[PDB]
Amino acid sequence: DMTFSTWTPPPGVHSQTLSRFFDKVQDLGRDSKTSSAEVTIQNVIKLVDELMEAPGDVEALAPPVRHLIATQLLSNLEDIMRILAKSLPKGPFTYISPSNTELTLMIQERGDKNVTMGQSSARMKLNWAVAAGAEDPGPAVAGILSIQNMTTLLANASLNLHSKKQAELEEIYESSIRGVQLRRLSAVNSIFLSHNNTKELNSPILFAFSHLESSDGEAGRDPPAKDVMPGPRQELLCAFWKSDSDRGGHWATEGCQVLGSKNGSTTCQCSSLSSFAILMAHYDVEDWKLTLITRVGLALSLFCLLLCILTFLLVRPIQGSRTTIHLHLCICLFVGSTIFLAGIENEGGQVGLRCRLVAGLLHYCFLAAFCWMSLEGLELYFLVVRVFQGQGLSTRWLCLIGYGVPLLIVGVSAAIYSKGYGRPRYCWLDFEQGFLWSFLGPVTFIILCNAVIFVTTVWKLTQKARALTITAIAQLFLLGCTWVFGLFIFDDRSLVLTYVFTILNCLQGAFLYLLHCLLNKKVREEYRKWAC
Ligand SMILES: *[C@@H]1O[C@H](CO)[C@@H](O)[C@H](O)[C@H]1NC(C)=O
Ligand SMILES: *[C@@H]1O[C@H](CO)[C@@H](O)[C@H](O)[C@H]1NC(C)=O
Ligand SMILES: *[C@@H]1O[C@H](CO)[C@@H](O)[C@H](O)[C@H]1NC(C)=O
Nearest protein Cα to ligand 1, atom 11: 149
Sheet holding 256-262, edge to edge: 114-117, 122-127, 205-210, 265-270, 256-262
Q: Which residue in 76, 74, 71 sits closest to 249, CA to CA?
A: 71
519 beta partners? none
User: Which stretch of DSSP H or E encloses residue 22?
Assistant: helix 16-31
d(CA 471, CA 460): 17
> Ligand 1 pocket check: which of 57, 148, 151 to mutate, most ligand atoms within 8 Å of Cβ?
151
d(CA 337, CA 120): 58
- Give the number of the atom of ligand 3 that is nearest the alpha carbon of residue 224: 14
Contact 126, 142 (CB under 8 A): yes
Which residues, including other chains, have CB under 8 Å from residue 277's CB and lie 6 or more apart? 184, 186, 187, 188, 189, 209, 239, 240, 241
Query: What kind of experiment solved this structure?
Result: cryo-EM
d(CA 276, CA 279): 10
Computed from CA positions of residues 355, 360, 366, 368, in that sequence, does the dihedral angle turn out positive or negative? negative
Q: Which residue in 441, 372, 439 sits closest to 400, CA to CA?
A: 372
Alpha carbons within 13 angstroms on the beta-carbon side of residue 403 total 13
Q: Which residue in 229, 237, 238, 226 sits closest to 264, CA to CA?
A: 226
- Give the number of the atom of ligand 2 that is nearest the alpha carbon of residue 183: 13
- Give the number of the atom of ligand 1 that is nearest the alpha carbon of residue 53: 5
Percent helix, strand, coil in the chain (nearest 5)?
Answer: 50, 15, 35
Which residues, including other chains, have CB under 8 Å from residue 371's CB and lie 6 or more apart? 401, 402, 405, 406, 446
CA angle 427, 432, 433 (to 5 degrees): 135
Ligand nearest to the CA of residue 214, numbered in listed order: 1
Alpha carbons within 13 angstroms on the beta-carbon side of residue 118 total 20
Nearest protein Cα to ligand 2, atom 14: 156
d(CA 518, CA 179): 52
480 pocket-lining for ligand 1 (C-beta < 6 Å): no
Amino acid at 49: D
User: Which stretch of DSSP H or E encloses residue 51?
Assistant: helix 37-53
CA 263 to ligand 3 center in whole angstroms? 6
DSSP secondary structure string, 122-173?
A: EEEEEETHHHH-SS--S-EEEEEEE-S-GGGTSTT--B---HHHHHHHHHHH
Contact 47, 20 (CB under 8 A): no
Chain centroid to Cα 345, Å, comes to 14
Contact 268, 258 (CB under 8 A): yes
Which residues, including other chains, have CB under 8 Å from residue 129's CB and lie 6 or more apart? 110, 111, 112
CA 124 to ligand 1 center in whole angstroms? 27
Give the three-state DSSP class for 13. Answer: coil
155 pocket-lining for ligand 2 (C-beta < 6 Å): yes
What is each CA distance from 405 to 76, 317, 360, 366, 401, in whole angstroms? 74, 30, 14, 12, 5
Nearest protein Cα to ligand 1, atom 14: 149
| Full set of structural domains in the chain with CATH | 16-211+230-284 (2.60.220.50), 292-530 (1.20.1070.10)
- Give the number of the atom of ligand 1 that is nearest the alpha carbon of residue 148: 13
55 pocket-lining for ligand 1 (C-beta < 6 Å): yes
- Give the number of the atom of ligand 2 that is nearest the alpha carbon of residue 156: 14
Cα distance from N-terminal residue to C-terminal residue, the chain = 108
CA 156 to ligand 2 center in whole angstroms? 6
d(CA 140, CA 97): 25
